[PDB]
Every structure is written in structure tokens, then in C-alpha cells.
Amino acid sequence: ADVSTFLAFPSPEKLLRLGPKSSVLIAQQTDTSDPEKVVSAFLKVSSVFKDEATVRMAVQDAVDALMQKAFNSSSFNSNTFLTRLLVHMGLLKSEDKVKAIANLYGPLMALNHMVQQDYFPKALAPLLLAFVTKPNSALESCSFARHSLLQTLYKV
Amino acid sequence: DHINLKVAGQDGSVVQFKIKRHTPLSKLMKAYCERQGLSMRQIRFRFDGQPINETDTPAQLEMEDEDTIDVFQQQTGG
Amino acid sequence: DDDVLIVYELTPTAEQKALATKLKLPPTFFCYKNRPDYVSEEEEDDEDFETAVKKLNGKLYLDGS
Amino acid sequence: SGIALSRLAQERKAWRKDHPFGFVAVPTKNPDGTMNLMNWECAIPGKKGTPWEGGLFKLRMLFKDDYPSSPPKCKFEPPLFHPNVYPSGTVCLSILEEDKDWRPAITIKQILLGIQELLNEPNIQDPAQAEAYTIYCQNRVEYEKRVRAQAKKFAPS
């Protein structure tokens, strides 16, 4: 109900006010067969990332929720998801037109957590690596998130 | 020291130059570009599958009377 | 008194030129009609893709002809 | 443009008489038996001397009535492993974009020739697909290994 209202206008405030169950409320709310829809969810969540433990964990958990419920479906193509992610992050071109996004800080932080998670499809790592390495102004606009994610990806 | 040269474009244009063996190809390219109405950086020239130079002469490139040069319109993947 | 000269270029007939122009094609496009071996007829073309591929007999490139 | 159908007509006519060896461009059939000139089934041979050698790559060409003010869309069927080919199989090339390099005087002949060229000369700065970009940048020998296996796979007969 109000979970819906959060997704259209994401804030670190709105997210916390969904209470302790938010990760599940999110994971249920979204269609987890559809990479594009999972991507849309994932970004909306990651956007509100802050480095302070409450919001951090409330994001990281919500991502873990969403992503574990996708990768376990055979109905979910990881490569399509990763591809569609890259396109929305603006790292890869697409035939369709997407509104791309100012800050990659959150997405990057979210990704940094998701990758060292067990449920993560390790075969996706090198791909993700190649587009994080690839020059991008926006990637440059948070160097630290980028670098700590790269550093995580090297370890696999 | 008077030879013929055929320049053959991807559009199936055929432009035949007469020219002397000691003469550097840069003039020919220029003349061809001008005649075909296209820019010299936008177009590339090749002999025997291999690129050709401003410096290059039919002498250097061991060219024959009825021989042929190929033109390539620039393009790039995206 | 100069060196490099254009002695020849492939040229179409006035009617062939007009057609290319109308169709925004290269001027030389219809010059194949000027060949000696050209027959102004070809049959009605029913011929499917699969057939054309087969017709290649797996030979993609050239050789001593 | 009124000239789309008429031009495709002449292009097909010309092609039958004179075309590059190894290539196929065949317009498909309307259900009433006429040729559909907005839809052609094409095949492009890998270039000899390249890891693409030996394969024959099926490509569909879709036109519209603004042809040739606009270029056709060109999809590899099935989608190909190549940095400038989309997952959809869509070929991404400057002479196929209405404004950069596309011009009305460019012909299907040149298009196929051009797409042929793009096989062994990919542009890595602006990939159309993650998979092929990654490998090319990671180990170029592995990249070529994949390209060769794709040629074999699409080898004809």
C-alpha cells in the first residue's frame, strides 16, 4: 500500500517508515520474473543509500531480499538483468531510450554488497567488472564507491 | 612514364586516371575526391588489399597499366 | 603543361541517369544494362532464400575461377 | 517517399544480375505471392583471412516507406557474438544511422559489404552488448576462439 508510494518517490525516510519488514514487502511487491522490473526496483532502492548503519542495512537487506528471490527462479535471466542494469546506470547503450541518473553512489554501494553475497551468480562478475572499469563521467563522480566495488570484484 | 589507373568506388563508380610512374598518389586521391565530391579524411584508398600513402608512387607500389585502386567509405560500429 | 589527368569515367545513358536520380541511387547504378552480355529479360523471380543459400554449394570465396 | 518500393524493386533487379560473391539478399513473400520488399532475408559470408572466415551469417533487413531517406533496420538472425551487435541481433553501425553516415545513395550492396566489414573491425569504445565486449577486453585470444567457433557453427552446407 504505502510501499507502493515509496517506489514512485524513493527516500531514505519513506524506506525506514515501512518498518522492520520492508525488505520482504519490497520483494513481494515487485515482479521477480521480469529483469527490467527487478532492475527498476533495485535502482529505486539503492538510490536512497546512506553510509549510516541504519539506512545502509535497511538498503542492503532490501537488495538481498529482492535479489535472492530472482536468481532462484529459472524464469529469471541473469544476463538480461545485468545488461538492463548497465543500460540504466548509463554504462551501456540501448535501442530504447532510458532516463539515466545523476548519482551512481547508491547503486554502486548496493552492488558492492550484492556481489560478495553467496546468492550472487559469480559468472556475472567479469561482465560487471568490465563496465565498472570502462570510463564514465558518472562513475568518476563517485570514485570511492567505484573503487571499493572494483576491489571487491577483483577478489573473485 | 605514362600509365593508366582505375579508381573504383563502393557505389560502382569507375574513374580512370592517366598518370606518370614517378608521381605521388596524393594528387590522384585529391582529384578523385573532388570529382566524386567527398572528403579525403572520410575516404580511404587501398592497393592489393593494402593501404596507400600521400608519399606513394606507382613506382614504389609496382603498378600496372590497367590496374585498379579501391575506395572505402568510412564507417564505425556503435 | 601538367601531370595527373582523368581520361575516363563510367557514365550512364540519359535515361539511366534520370532513373538513378529519381530513386536517389548512384549515377552508375544501371550501367550493367550497358554490358554486351546483358539480356534485357530475366524471368519472374519466385526464388526463395533457402534455395539461394543452397545454390552456393558451400563455396563462400573465390579462386582460380 | 513514393520511391521506396520502386527503388527496392530496382535494387533486387540489379542484385540478381550483379552482386558480390558469397552474399545472399532475398526479399520475402507477401502471402498473396508477391515479394515483400520491406522485408529481405540476407546472408553475409565471414571475410577470408579473418577468424570470421567460413561462416555464413543470416541477417534480416527491414525497410519502411521513408526509404531511402532513412536506412533499413538490420538484425542478425540469430543474434551474433560481436561488440556492435545488440542482444536483439540489431546491427549497430554508423552508416545505418540516419544521421551520422547514412546517405540515400548507399545501397543494400554497400550495406551488406559494410556490415561484412564491421565483423572484423569492431568499435570497442561503444559496445552494443556486454558479453562480447567483456571477452574482447579480457583475453583477445579467447575472443577470437569464440569468433572462430561461431564461424564453424554458421558454416554452410
Swiss-Prot record, chain A:
Changing residue 93 to R: Loss of cross-link to SUMO1. Abolishes association with nuclear pores during interphase, and with mitotic spindles during mitosis. There is a cross-link at residue 93 (Glycyl lysine isopeptide (Lys-Gly) (interchain with G-Cter in SUMO1)). A motif (SUMO conjugation) lies at residues 92-95. Phosphorylation occurs before nuclear envelope breakdown and continues throughout mitosis. Phosphorylated by the M-phase kinase cyclin B/Cdk1, in vitro. Differential timimg of dephosphorylation occurs during phases of mitosis. The phosphorylated form remains associated with RANBP2/NUP358 and the SUMO E2-conjugating enzyme, UBE2I, on nuclear pore complex (NPC) diassembly and during mitosis. Sumoylated. Sumoylation is necessary for targeting to the nuclear envelope (NE), and for association with mitotic spindles and kinetochores during mitosis. Also required for interaction with RANBP2 and is mediated by UBE2I. Desumoylated by HINT1. The record marks 131, 134 as: Hydrophobic interaction with UBE2I. It is found in: Cytoplasm; Nucleus, Nucleoplasm; Nucleus envelope; Chromosome, Centromere, Kinetochore. It comes from the Eukaryota. Coiled coil: none annotated. The modification Phosphothreonine is found at residue 5. The modification Phosphoserine is found at residues 4, 11. Highly expressed in brain, thymus and testis. There is a cross-link at residues 21, 93, 155 (Glycyl lysine isopeptide (Lys-Gly) (interchain with G-Cter in SUMO2)). The modification N6-acetyllysine is found at residue 93. GTPase activator for RAN. Converts cytoplasmic GTP-bound RAN to GDP-bound RAN, which is essential for RAN-mediated nuclear import and export. Mediates dissociation of cargo from nuclear export complexes containing XPO1, RAN and RANBP2 after nuclear export. Belongs to the RNA1 family. It comes from Homo sapiens (Human).
UniProtKB/Swiss-Prot annotation, chain B:
It comes from Homo sapiens (Human). Its main location: nucleus. There is a cross-link at residue 6 (Glycyl lysine isopeptide (Lys-Gly) (interchain with G-Cter in SUMO2)). Ubiquitin-like protein that can be covalently attached to proteins as a monomer or as a lysine-linked polymer. Covalent attachment via an isopeptide bond to its substrates requires prior activation by the E1 complex SAE1-SAE2 and linkage to the E2 enzyme UBE2I, and can be promoted by an E3 ligase such as PIAS1-4, RANBP2, CBX4 or ZNF451. This post-translational modification on lysine residues of proteins plays a crucial role in a number of cellular processes such as nuclear transport, DNA replication and repair, mitosis and signal transduction. This is Small ubiquitin-related modifier 2. GO terms for cellular component: GABA-ergic synapse; glutamatergic synapse; hippocampal mossy fiber to CA3 synapse; nucleoplasm; nucleus; PML body; postsynaptic cytosol; presynaptic cytosol. Residues 1-78 form the Ubiquitin-like domain. Changing residue 20 to E: Significantly impairs sumoylation of MTA1.
UniProtKB/Swiss-Prot annotation, chain C:
The chain holds residues 2629 to 2693 of 3224 of the full protein. Belongs to the RanBP2 E3 ligase family. The modification Phosphotyrosine is found at residue 38. This is E3 SUMO-protein ligase RanBP2. Changing residue 28 to A: Impairs SUMO E3 ligase activity. E3 SUMO-protein ligase which facilitates SUMO1 and SUMO2 conjugation by UBE2I. Involved in transport factor (Ran-GTP, karyopherin)-mediated protein import via the F-G repeat-containing domain which acts as a docking site for substrates. Binds single-stranded RNA (in vitro). May bind DNA. Component of the nuclear export pathway. Specific docking site for the nuclear export factor exportin-1. Inhibits EIF4E-dependent mRNA export. Sumoylates PML at 'Lys-490' which is essential for the proper assembly of PML-NB. Changing residue 26 to A: Impairs SUMO E3 ligase activity. Changing residue 7 to K: Abolishes interaction with sumoylated RANGAP1. Sequence repeats lie at residues 5-57. It is found in: Nucleus; Nucleus membrane; Nucleus, Nuclear pore complex; Nucleus envelope. Contains FG repeats. FG repeats are interaction sites for karyopherins (importins, exportins) and form probably an affinity gradient, guiding the transport proteins unidirectionally with their cargo through the NPC. FG repeat regions are highly flexible and lack ordered secondary structure. The overall conservation of FG repeats regarding exact sequence, spacing, and repeat unit length is limited. The modification Phosphoserine is found at residue 40.
From Swiss-Prot, chain D:
The active site is at 92 (glycyl thioester intermediate). The modification N-acetylserine is found at residue 1. It is found in: Nucleus; Cytoplasm; Cytoplasm, Perinuclear region. Residues 12-17 are annotated as: Interaction with SUMO1. InterPro entries: Ub_conjugating_enzyme (IPR050113), UBQ-conjugat_E2_core (IPR000608), UBQ-conjugating_AS (IPR023313), UBQ-conjugating_enzyme/RWD (IPR016135). Keywords: Acetylation, ATP-binding, Cell cycle, Cell division, Chromosome partition, Cytoplasm, Host-virus interaction, Isopeptide bond, Mitosis, Nucleotide-binding, Nucleus, Phosphoprotein, Transferase, Ubl conjugation, Ubl conjugation pathway. GO terms for cellular component: cytoplasm; cytosol; glutamatergic synapse; nuclear envelope; nuclear pore; nucleoplasm; nucleus; perinuclear region of cytoplasm. Changing residue 86 to A: Impairs catalytic activity. Expressed in heart, skeletal muscle, pancreas, kidney, liver, lung, placenta and brain. Also expressed in testis and thymus. It is an enzyme of class 2 (transferase). Residues 3-156 form the UBC core domain. The keyword Phosphoprotein applies. One of its GO terms (biological process) is mitotic nuclear membrane reassembly. There is a cross-link at residue 17 (Glycyl lysine isopeptide (Lys-Gly) (interchain with G-Cter in ubiquitin)). One of its GO terms (molecular function) is SUMO conjugating enzyme activity. There is a cross-link at residues 17, 47-48, 100 (Glycyl lysine isopeptide (Lys-Gly) (interchain with G-Cter in SUMO2)). The modification N6-acetyllysine is found at residue 64. Its main location: nucleus. Pathway: Protein modification; protein sumoylation. There is a cross-link at residue 48 (Glycyl lysine isopeptide (Lys-Gly) (interchain with G-Cter in SUMO1)). Belongs to the ubiquitin-conjugating enzyme family. PANTHER family: UBIQUITIN-CONJUGATING ENZYME E2 (PTHR24067). This is SUMO-conjugating enzyme UBC9. It comes from Homo sapiens.
